[PDB]
Design a protein around this nucleic acid. Structure first.
Ligand SMILES: [Zn+2]
Lengths: 115, 57, 304, 19, 62, 98, 192, 69, 131
RNA sequence: AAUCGAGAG
């Protein structure tokens, strides 16, 4: 589980060659379906992936204590600026390639680091 | 082998939770790719598993 | 029509760099079906040597035996994989290991307190003797013909500074580890690459001229050596695509929303290979090519 | 309210493989 | 505290009818967590090898 | 034992067969399928893995005629071998050049 | 053997396609397969000969009894020039053609789906699913078609071909949209 | 507890860099990003392995059943 | 053999949330009442507004197999040939008719006088376009 | 065997 109540059982140990890989070369160690979010509405997990990627890139730790951001200073903007100033994109997407066919996937893939 | 969170509250240090690690920072792809994680399942990399990811006794 | 000759006319390789650990190169006019085959073979099928069977004789340390054996299995070994054969699993445990397929490593280390340590010393290396166990402490114990065949090149870890364990006085570790040939599709410890992958060569199609100050900001939306301002006319042009990390920061401005299209060259793969330490990256790639060819030949010669 | 403190000294960390 | 009588032995849900006639513990059954599998037929079940060696079927030899 | 012809799917004239290969995955399957789809005589070609947890690969080859699925498979395998040979030779040439 | 025959014929899962509560279907693909079908059956989906044949074989695999012809039958491409390009709706059509028994016509279903025409732009008619002789000619397959929905394609196949063929169609569609989802992944993020 | 031998994601050997990371943090007045870069950790998957290690082995080692306290 | 032929002046092209296909509103230059709507992938046959296209519907080109050396067909005289089937007819009014074609999901609606559209029947037909 | 407490769906 994440720290946002996204519990789930491990369904398969996916071999690393069959895992999708990014333009950076890294292959995620956890895959979570995008359909876990629309009904659960855990946007904290999205912003935590964003902030974790930015922190692991800049070698910093970001605080996540509630009510430090607001609707004029959005964490999306904050961590996106931090990601853009490091060579990755604003929205945390990464160009990934299918590990079974080797083709680039249809769209950029949302990746990051979460606890 | 636990790790400290990259994203943590300011009170994580105030209660000294680093003395008691609870998890690990993981590279998580929000992707519908495998077919083996739809309802609530999740997929763990086999190689990461063999490198001691999430091991315990 | 497609033919091997028509592929041989157009395929080409551009080695961008090559070290003893990392090799960066290009494969042009090839299909993802073959580039991905090479990448998958590099990660999973190319053999290497790692610790498999650990025979503990004493472990009074804080790290438990299974964890210590796992760590000893993870440390990469500078062994040429051709120098040893493959273990026949069906054979009994007595005759399974021999001098031509098994490499014996030992680790005997006792911690005793240092009686000369200064008062107020907080450094474990000054307070205790052998308070740290490193991969370099894994001695190599040759047996049989390998006492002569390995005399040219003794077996040492590729990273002798790997901190295997820590000790305190009275505590000790005494173990033997058997190292054999294995492939990374079985266990990730046998994988001979830190990471081998590729990426398509990015394309930056400029559609309309970006003359003026817009060139300064358009060039500002890419890695530093990707867009340049032409000396003659104040125009932006693509200098180097390989320098671009595809981040689509240009798309985030509606100024350039209809001035540039970002795509890829679907046949121009930039292979980046890093070696764990046992083999050079160029030899890793060569072995993967040979593995694909040999497996195809085995299928060809197999009766149906 | 003071906005969240913008971290300073932010440089490029991501470069294309081989460079 | 009081020692149950015969009527108390059958009266309720925890009695004898509802716990040993209407429902029963059974042989040749198994229980485990479920995980998804899209490569299994929609009319099938994915049986672990640990169950497949403990569950048997009487087969008259012909 | 390595390569097996699935008789329940083969054609009587041999122009449409189906092959089961053990200990193989996308790595060989995709390469072989791409190379076989270069034969101008093959009508249908694809690969499928019945179950990911099993190391079994299935290859289907249907030809227009004048050959067989076995012959198309042999041609694709040989073409794959030659493709690997040319890649190896060109890589070595560029290594020596440097 | 009596309990075997009861479980195979009376309590088997392919007999429970419709629940008796209201006669509505209770089986069908759920989330990733639905979101994959929306992508695969839009007009913007074109597939070369290699991609088309790979998808069809991957979802069919005739050696496991999935075909009714012992040899995969394909369709001519939608676009002949400049180069041969098929469509995802053609993928659906040939999937049906290979699972649906021969010497029997194809389904003629007129229905809808959940996505209004206004979401695809002016003049679109993709809200109106249409089958004719078993060829998907308009609209996108959705949750309304395969899923717990009445009068969709899987329900109509159930009605016209028995429950076994609808079970085969569910399995084949699940395999199709799974192999498609690894080739062209699906994701969500902050940009959405 | 003790530093992992390899990075979980890619597999790069990062077990020989924890002591160097501490040295570069203490002796040199380097920030964490600079120290990680100067160790050769470019991918954030490798950076996190050292940036977030806790090193509980030191606290475990103070409870020694084999030496008088 | 051919069943229809005309020259159409493309009026509007709208992508509509598609990155590959576009909807074309093309009105004929000869017949004042014959108009056309068609979906084609404009990454293979790009079309702009105010363009002239020679649209031909043919019953054949004189099963399928990728082209080989020495093969001739009606497609060689056109730039963009689609295959499909007719599914719907409609009496728009007196002296008017519309035929609905589906090319694997790409929709064409050809409305014209039934005198010149009488050759079109509910069968598989090839659409051929030229600039 | 009960009773109490902790859990899972
Ligand atoms: Zn890493």
């Amino acid at each position: 589980s994440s720290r946002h109540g996204q519990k789930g059982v491990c369904s398969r140990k996916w071999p690393t060659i069959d895992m999708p890989f990014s333009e950076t070369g890294i292959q995620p160690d956890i895959i979570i379906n995008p359909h876990a979010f629309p009904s659960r509405m855990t946007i904290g997990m999205f912003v935590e992936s964003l902030a974790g990627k930015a922190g692991a890139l800049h070698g910093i730790a970001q605080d996540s204590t509630p009510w430090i951001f607001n609707e004029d200073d959005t964490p999306a903007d904050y961590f996106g600026e931090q990601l853009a100033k490091a060579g990755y994109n604003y929205h945390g997407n990464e160009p990934m390639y299918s590990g079974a066919t080797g083709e680039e996937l249809r769209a950029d893939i949302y990746v990051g680091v979460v606890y | 082998t636990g790790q400290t969170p990259i994203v943590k509250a300011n009170l994580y240090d105030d209660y000294g939770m680093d003395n008691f690690p609870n998890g690990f920072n993981a590279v998580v792809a929000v992707i519908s790719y495998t077919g083996y994680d739809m309802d609530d399942a999740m997929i763990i990399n086999k190689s990461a598993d063999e490198r001691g990811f999430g091991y315990g006794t | 029509e497609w033919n091997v000759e028509k592929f041989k006319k157009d395929f080409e390789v551009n080695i961008s760099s090559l070290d003893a650990r990392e090799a960066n190169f290009d494969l042009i006019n090839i299909d993802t079906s073959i580039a991905n085959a090479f990448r998958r073979i590099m990660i999973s099928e190319v053999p290497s040597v790692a610790a498999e069977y650990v025979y503990f004789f004493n472990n009074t340390s804080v790290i438990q035996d299974e964890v210590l054996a796992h760590r000893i299995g993870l440390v990469p070994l500078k062994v040429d994989p051709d120098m040893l054969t493959w273990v026949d699993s069906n054979l009994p445990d007595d005759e399974k290991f021999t001098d031509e397929n098994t490499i014996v490593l030992s680790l005997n280390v006792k911690c005793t307190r240092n009686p000369d340590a200064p008062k107020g010393s907080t450094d474990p290396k000054e307070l205790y003797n052998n308070a740290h166990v490193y991969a370099r402490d894994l001695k190599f114990e040759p047996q049989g013909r390998q006492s002569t065949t390995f005399a040219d090149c003794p077996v040492v870890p590729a990273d002798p500074d790997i901190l295997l364990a820590k000790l305190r006085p009275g505590q000790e570790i005494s173990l033997k580890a058997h190292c054999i040939l294995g492939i990374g599709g079985d266990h990730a410890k046998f994988s001979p690459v830190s990471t081998a992958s590729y990426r398509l060569l990015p394309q930056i199609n400029i559609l309309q001229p970006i003359k003026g100050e817009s060139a300064r900001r358009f060039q500002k939306c890419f890695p530093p050596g990707v867009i340049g301002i032409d000396e003659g006319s104040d125009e932006a042009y693509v200098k180097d695509a390989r320098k671009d990390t595809v981040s689509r920061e240009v798309l985030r401005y509606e100024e350039f929303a209809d001035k540039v299209k970002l795509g890829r060259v679907r046949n121009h793969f930039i292979f980046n290979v890093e070696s764990a330490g046992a083999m050079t990256p160029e030899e890793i790639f060569f072995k993967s090519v040979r593995i694909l060819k040999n497996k195809a030949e085995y299928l060809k010669n197999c009766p149906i | 309210r003071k906005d969240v403190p913008k971290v300073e000294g932010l440089k490029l960390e991501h470069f294309a493989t081989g460079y | 505290v009081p020692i149950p009588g015969v009527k108390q032995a059958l009266e309720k849900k925890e009695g004898l009818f509802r716990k040993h006639m209407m429902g029963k513990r059974v042989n040749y059954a198994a229980r485990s967590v479920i995980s998804p599998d899209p490569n299994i037929e929609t009319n099938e079940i994915g049986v672990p090898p640990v169950f497949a060696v403990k569950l048997t079927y009487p087969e008259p030899v012909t | 034992e390595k390569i097996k012809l699935l008789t329940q799917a083969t054609s009587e004239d041999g122009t449409s067969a189906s092959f089961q290969i053990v200990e193989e995955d996308h790595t060989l399957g995709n390469a072989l399928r791409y190379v076989i789809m270069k034969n101008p005589d093959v009508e249908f070609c694809g690969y499928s893995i019945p179950h990911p947890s099993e190391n079994l690969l299935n290859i289907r080859i249907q030809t227009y005629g004048e050959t067989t699925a076995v012959d198309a498979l042999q041609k694709g395998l040989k073409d794959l071998m030659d493709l690997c040979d040319v890649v190896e030779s060109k890589f070595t040439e560029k290594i020596k050049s440097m | 053997e009596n309990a075997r025959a009861e479980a195979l014929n009376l309590a088997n899962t392919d007999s429970q396609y419709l629940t008796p509560t209201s006669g509505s279907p209770v089986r069908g693909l759920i989330q990733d397969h639905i979101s994959a079908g929306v992508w695969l059956t839009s007009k913007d989906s074109f597939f070369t000969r290699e991609q088309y044949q790979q998808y069809i074989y991957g979802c069919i695999r005739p050696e496991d009894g999935h075909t009714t012809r012992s040899k995969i039958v394909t369709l001519p491409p939608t676009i002949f020039k400049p180069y041969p390009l098929w469509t995802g709706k053609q993928i659906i059509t040939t999937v049906l053609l290979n699972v649906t028994p021969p010497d029997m016509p194809g389904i003629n279903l007129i229905s809808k789906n959940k996505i209004k025409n206004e979401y695809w732009g002016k003049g679109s008619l993709e809200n109106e699913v249409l089958f004719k002789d078993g060829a998907l000619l308009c609209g996108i397959l959705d949750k309304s078609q395969y899923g717990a929905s009445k009068y969709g394609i899987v329900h109509s196949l159930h009605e016209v071909y028995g429950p076994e063929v609808a079970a085969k169609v569910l399995s084949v569609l699940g395999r199709l949209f799974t192999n498609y989802i690894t080739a062209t992944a699906f994701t969500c993020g902050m940009d959405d | 507890m003790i530093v992992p031998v390899r990075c979980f994601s890619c597999g790069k050997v990062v077990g020989d860099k924890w002591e160097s990371y501490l040295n570069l943090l203490q002796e040199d007045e380097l920030d964490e990003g600079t120290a990680l870069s100067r160790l050769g950790l470019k991918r954030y998957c490798c950076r996190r392995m050292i940036l977030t290690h806790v090193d509980l082995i030191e606290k475990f080692l103070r409870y020694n059943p084999l030496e008088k306290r | 053999n051919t069943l229809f032929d005309d020259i159409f002046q493309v009026s509007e092209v709208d992508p509509g949330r598609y990155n590959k296909v576009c909807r074309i509103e093309a009105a004929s230059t000869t017949q004042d009442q014959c108009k056309l709507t068609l979906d084609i992938n404009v990454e293979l046959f790009p079309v702009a507004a105010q363009d002239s296209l020679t649209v031909t519907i043919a019953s054949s080109l004189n099963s399928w197999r990728p082209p080989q050396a020495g093969d001739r067909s009606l497609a060689d005289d056109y730039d963009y040939v689609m295959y499909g089937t007719a599914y719907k007819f409609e009496e728009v009014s007196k002296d008017l008719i519309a035929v609905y074609y589906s090319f694997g999901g790409l929709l064409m609606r050809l409305e014209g006088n039934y005198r010149n559209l009488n050759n079109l029947k509910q069968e598989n037909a090839y659409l051929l376009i030229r600039r």
